[PDB]
A paper describes a structure:
[name] recognizes RboP-(phospho-)core M3 as the RboP acceptor and transfers a RboP from CDP-Rbo to form the tandem RboP structure. Although [name] exhibits RboP transferase, not NTase activity, our crystal structure clearly shows that [name] belongs to the NTase superfamily as proposed previously. Our structural and biochemical analyses revealed the acceptor substrate recognition mechanism by dimer [name]: the phosphate group of RboP is recognized by the catalytic domain of one subunit, and a phosphate group on O-mannose is recognized by the stem domain of another subunit. Indeed, mutations of [name], which is involved in synthesis of a tandem RboP structure, cause congenital muscular dystrophy;17–23 more than 15 missense mutations in the [name] gene were found in LGMD2I (limb-girdle muscular dystrophy type 2I), MDDGB5 [muscular dystrophy-dystroglycanopathy (congenital with or without mental retardation, type B, 5)], and severe muscle-eye-brain disease/Walker-Warburg syndrome (MEB/WWS) patients (OMIM ID of [name]; 606596).
Author numbering:
A (entry chain D): 47 to 397, 400 to 491
B (entry chain B): 47 to 491
C (entry chain C): 47 to 432, 438 to 492
D (entry chain A): 46 to 432, 437 to 492
The structure:
């Protein structure tokens, strides 16, 4: 029946951790309390220097053993209560009751809101490591929940908390439930509530604005570190944490037609797909504006026919165009002389006998334009690459072209495009997805 | 179930604590371990400087809070396990079996012996603070004991251990069980054995001798601090820790006729009583051989009439003698010229206070027999000096004609005939039947 | 098998780790080999899929248990051999030759150079965390070293390696010996040599540039993360890793006149002292040219009298000046009308609160010299704010005294000067930082 | 409701005015909480009023009492405690709370009022140094603000402050309290209020006083030994010692490794041990100079002389180098190879086990020592045959230079700075290793 209060979410420049710890100490002078930090907080916390109150510094240090940063080693009790800064212990026995709430219930974490300006509300949460995405929403089975948002004391067993890979990664409210929801654990939000501190931290607009900013920075670094590129919400809100126009793309050059993320049993990072989708939309826009006749090719046509979007592990977009229209588009005229950075940042190059448009000078997510010319009613070209799907095809497949949803817009595809896709890939290609190179890595 | 190992019994100059602690760490790397020492052990213990292994220094220090020397602040777990030096954890999960045994059973402590040359064995023990006595014997209902002798891992709840007044006084083997047995607590000796250290401490004959010496000195200091004058064992073995012939008596000058121990709700220390009996016996023998007519007086006669022994809170022995007999006894003759130390170290002297003699056990220990000389006037025994006590009166000489034998303090003493009537005349009716402290207005039974 | 080969220093884009692994299995099929990486290396390594070869990915992951990112999990042997990329096992049975060497000797680490272009050289190393410095030099007791430079297989007991805080932090060649030297452990460089890979990694100038760019960035992040602000070779060729003119000072704002580094049981960062010496010399150079009578004051005069430098745990320089002299310095006159950033980046300010001047290293780095103006009153040096008054004869004359790399002026009889303001014996009894007492207050 | 608990700790059981003290405070508030603390039950009996707010707190372990019984805070329900010394009396109602209003309205954590005895409390300065095992008393420069008191004072502080010290009621309280509070930087403000003396004051005869002063001094000397105070000084002088000397053992035992016990307790060398080493160094030097042995400071002694002219504060021996061709001129030295030599002044001179050096110990029992290292000049370089210890050129000794050290003048090698850096490394004088307790804990 012994519970270690463990404090991790606080700002060194402005906290109420002294009040927090003293408030628990008034209910039990021998109360085990562990304040955790990456480095020594300054200005000093000035905690009581008694054996049951310890400061656990989790960063590596040349004069400290491995144990010194492993937090479970500061915790001897069966249960641990994560307490946010701004909380206060007043009524005695509140942790005893969360403990017997836990043993009675079936959720492996119980939680009690702190009566702050943002008391913990309950959230649904699915984590897709394969798609680098976490999706929150309202919780159907509240007070049974996957995740919380807001301030709460969270009690669970030390064996449960400290077997996680990142038990106290900040922000705790995000990092913890990402790991427990993935494991299928539930948090049950009890009806107990902890009081707020009497002199709460971040009392001024300047202080809380500095806290929020540093807090947004920790959260971004956390999600980047743990393979979450995108956080989405019921209602449509999106939080992006990956590549954009000014960065590089999220993965290096692709060997064996098998991108790095597949070997990590992951698919294309959602920010990379999104850059491809806007490059695709942009390139189609200037192609159509130039009167260049284009059509979805390769995996782009496949993904469009299969589910109207980029195949979730693909990393480029492929369009075929008529060779004799190439001249009508300015960017492409220039691309034959050299690389072309147009007024919107996209990079047009010729390299191969095809053209490539890159999202930006730094982000090399590309659209490939393959020019074909007709010879005896057969679309062909003069340079080949060793792939099953790089072949000639009858021109009647382009007479006419048909509207086909793709990557958020309506594209042009060959008529009878399922027959077209069967021609280049083999029978059943639409219904039988497979990785770009099953020889090395197969879905 | 989380259990803190707590090491309190070891010697800084030769121990196996590093191996003890490391052997528990090889079963659980985050095992909470608390080494408790009065002062920082030198040479260094060199325990792993890791957060789950702490060293509790229970000394006062100018730069530490009160909590620093209170061992409960170093234990966060619900159960704690006292582990003696020389024990090593072999079998994984030995303490988990101890915790569930304790919750299944009804004893507040459970114990596992360690496979040393002296594994813990079951003992009975009652403690009598009023008589400063601890009485050990064989355990009637083993494996449920009041106390153990020898090396054991003892597991209990921290709340129970650290509500004791001296949880880790040394030797813990003695200290712990006097406190738990006085509280009616049982220790269940389990059929679980911890292994001994592969390199046991005290390997040399010189170190064990040095180790036993500190232990015996620590043990004697413990019982003196706790009011245990006498430790008795079935089979009759007696260990004493009070006064003796060559020290001072246990208590100081008695004021108000009420000795210090009575206010502490204890009776006369067993060592003082024993000195008084052997002084009473010896003086009676001197007086008989010298031809001095004596009889038991005051509290000595009263105690004799009640149960043939000194009243359990009394501090002296009183005898009456015939004044015309003092010249018969060599020690009494010298006493009037000055204080005399005789053939056996007893000190005979005439008292400052009116006209009586006093025989002290030794020069240093002033437990004493008082010799009150009386002389007859008209068949009335009297003296020229009188203390201001109610039992200090004249009495008819016929009470002394003749004397009757009466057991007292292990020998047969001489007493007034009709000593009931004698005692009631001096103390008031019913004195024999109604024991009472020497001054009820200050401290009553 | 008593040794687990553990390879940590390699690059995903160009390596010879497959050759490395293969070479050791060709000598023993059962050889335990762990390739450690922060994330899954790409292009794939395609090492043998056997139980004794395991890839340890040490970064925390949402789907993995805590044990998965701890290197001791992947090692079940008594000894670990740290093998750098580019090494290769050619002769058989040299890892246990390295074991029999470790057993017999007194060093906790043994090492054998790899026959690369950069084979391991024996190095001396002392780590002072209180001075945030790593001092390297040639090894006086070679082949017994405190550190290596270059390619070597290093073998030590797995219990020793994985008990350190940062056992596999990169670069290993730097992180390992910063940890083991600090513990006073030694490394014995054997007369044994590992062959190089027959297809050595980073064979091109471009690959080597990419590797060194990344390796230098790792090294700088490691030194910062472990509080090594200065690295030196034989007292020279200094490499800095702390603050400078374009950053903030290392310790931020000071509360209770106790800077952060004291609570971390250290002295002033050496990059901060270097800035303080530079500002003291710059300000003294500016006062001497403007014709401003100054003298060292407080802890700078005490430092100068004791060892002729800034006291190694102090964080500012203090100078006394004549108040009537301030009008002769452009910055001082401008500082009284507001904050001044002069031609060389120092900011001269007139603290409204204390009635004194302050010259900071730069707009961002607030290490500062304090200027305290006195004016003569009836023979005594005084001011209107409050550190004591003192007779003027201490300044008639003023005396050359070495301090912080240059000759500054101090009160005459400065030992008596110091004794009056600080107490007798002050020069001989430094208040050494007291971490124990600082905890109590 | 009363907010102050009177606490009485300094009295003698054989002679006291505690019954009068207690009656005086109850005479002004019959519900006033009063606690009398003692190690054992005071005899002769105190016979205090058998009332619930008067309690005897017996502070020693007892076989039949709970832990709380020997803890003084158990006996105090108020925010404030007034330590009252025997001999004091409450004649003027209301002073207890004027001390409380004064404490609240001021900035010192303790306030005090003198008792109008023959020894009324005087204001003192006190800096404690655990590293140097010294308490340094002096006149209080900022009176009425003190670090310590001398004499009889009712001292009032918060219960929470007093009972969180390690030895709140250790005797004599006038020593133990202020050693602990001055160490923390706390201040005691001696108010301008006065308590009356007992109408029948305790210890009114010389014999009674003599008994009380002998017990007090014994408690004080035990208190300083237990607490690691080896030297009390008044205005830098009037030294009072509580450590080792010529007839005791030396404070630390046999040293293991190169680390004496005092280092692991985060202290430096005991001042008694430094004092005996200065006495021995001077004695040894005086003997060698009289006998005509060429000596010079060596090792850490030369380093201490160069740096600040004394033994380095955490060093435990003195080293001197001597010319071997000169040993025959010292009687104690020639006898030293025959065997151990106690000289006329108690110093023990012995030849090395096998190390080939001479050791002069302060006494047979106190093994603080000066080591004499003989060298000879092979080709102008100083050598010994078995072994900071290094060869060094002989010209450093031609000639020898005077150098102040340990309260006298000793001979040093010429250019001792260059010498020291050959021996220890560059800049050894200016950057002193003071012991790192953490690193030594790490090892
Ligand atoms: N049966 C198949 C065959 C290919 N594909 C995908 O279609 C894409 C074709 O790549 P290209 O656009 O380079 O032709 C690849 O991402 C490949 O994995 C698929 O999803 N199902
Ligand atoms: N009714 C009584 C009266 C006295 N006594 C005891 O008898 C003793 C008398 O002491 P003296 O005769 O030595 O003066 C005391 O120990 C006293 O307590 C008793 O046990 N019962
Ligand atoms: N006796 C002293 C007094 C100060 N010093 C140090 O020199 C500096 C002088 O203090 P101020 O800068 O506060 O004047 C402080 O770091 C101080 O502790 C010292 O090293 N020895
Ligand atoms: N830089 C250094 C090096 C050694 N020392 C001191 O030198 C002494 C060791 O030298 P000895 O072996 O000569 O005694 C120790 O007191 C040690 O603290 C020092 O105070 N500063
Ligand atoms: C989580 O996934 C489940 C599928 O099992 C789905 O029903 C639910 O809507 C998802 N919730 C969120 C917030 O995405
Ligand atoms: C993980 O769980 C196991 C089993 O409950 C436990 O033994 C271990 O200590 C846990 N790990 C921690 C607490 O780091
Ligand atoms: C682990 O490291 C710490 C160093 O801080 C040390 O005290 C401990 O004994 C080490 N344990 C082992 C087995 O080396
Ligand atoms: C403890 O008390 C019981 C009950 O009087 C008694 O039978 C038993 O003998 C006592 N124990 C000892 C060891 O004398
Ligand atoms: C004493 O027991 C009580 C339970 O009645 C518990 O709350 C308290 O913590 C215990 N005290 C110590 C010092 O362990
Ligand atoms: C490193 O420290 C040792 C300590 O004795 C010193 O003597 C040596 O000269 C130092 N070397 C360097 C390169 O600083
Ligand atoms: C106490 O410390 C101050 C500051 O170091 C010093 O000036 C003073 O003399 C010290 N007091 C005594 C009595 O030593
Ligand atoms: Mg494609
Ligand atoms: Mg393509
Ligand atoms: Mg009697
Ligand atoms: Mg009598
Ligand atoms: Mg300064
Ligand atoms: Mg300043
Ligand atoms: Mg020395
Ligand atoms: Mg020596
Ligand atoms: Zn991306
Ligand atoms: Zn006795
Ligand atoms: Zn810096
Ligand atoms: Zn000493």
């Amino acid at each position: 029946p012994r519970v270690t209060v463990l404090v991790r979410e606080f700002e060194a420049f402005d906290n109420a951790v002294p009040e927090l710890v003293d408030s628990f100490l008034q209910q039990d002078p021998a109360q085990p309390v562990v304040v955790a930090a990456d480095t020594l907080p300054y200005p000093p916390l000035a905690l009581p220097r008694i054996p049951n109150v310890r400061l656990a510094l989790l960063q590596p240090a040349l004069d400290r053993p491995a144990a010194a940063s492993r937090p479970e080693t500061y915790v001897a009790t069966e249960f641990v209560a994560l307490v946010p800064d701004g909380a206060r212990a007043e009524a005695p026995g509140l942790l005893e009751r969360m403990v017997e709430a836990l043993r009675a219930g079936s959720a492996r974490l119980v939680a009690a809101p702190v009566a702050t300006a943002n008391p913990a509300r309950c959230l649904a949460l699915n984590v897709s490591l394969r798609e680098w995405t976490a999706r929150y929403g309202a919780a159907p089975a509240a007070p049974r929940c996957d995740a919380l948002d807001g301030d709460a004391v969270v009690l669970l067993r030390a064996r449960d908390l400290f077997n996680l890979s990142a038990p106290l990664a900040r922000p705790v409210g995000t990092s913890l439930f990402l790991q427990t929801a993935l494991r299928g654990w539930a948090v049950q939000l009890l009806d107990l509530t902890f009081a707020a501190a009497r002199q709460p931290p971040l009392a001024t607009a300047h202080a809380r604005w500095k806290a929020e900013r540093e807090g947004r920075a920790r959260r971004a670094a956390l999600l980047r570190a743990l393979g979450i590129r995108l956080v989405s919400w019921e209602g449509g809100r999106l939080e992006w944490f990956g590549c954009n126009k000014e960065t590089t793309r999220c993965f290096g050059t692709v060997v064996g037609d098998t991108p790095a993320y597949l070997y990590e049993e992951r698919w294309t990072p959602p920010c990379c797909l999104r850059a491809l989708r806007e490059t695709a939309r942009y390139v189609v826009g200037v192609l159509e504006a130039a009167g260049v006749r284009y059509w979805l090719e390769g995996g782009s046509l496949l993904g469009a026919a299969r589910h109207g979007d980029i195949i979730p592990w693909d990393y480029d977009v492929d369009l075929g165009i008529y060779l004799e229209d190439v001249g009508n588009c300015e960017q492409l005229r220039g691309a034959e002389a050299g690389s072309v950075v147009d007024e919107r940042g996209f990079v047009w190059e010729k390299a191969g006998d095809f053209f490539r448009v890159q999202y930006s000078e730094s982000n090399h997510l590309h659209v490939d334009l393959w020019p074909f010319y007709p010879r005896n009613g057969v679309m062909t070209k003069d340079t080949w690459l060793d792939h099953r799907q790089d072949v000639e095809f009858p021109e009647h497949f382009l007479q006419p072209l048909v509207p086909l949803p793709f990557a958020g817009f309506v594209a042009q595809a060959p008529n009878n495009y399922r027959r077209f896709l069967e021609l280049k890939f083999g029978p059943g290609v639409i219904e039988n997805p497979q990785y770009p190179n099953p020889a090395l890595l197969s879905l």
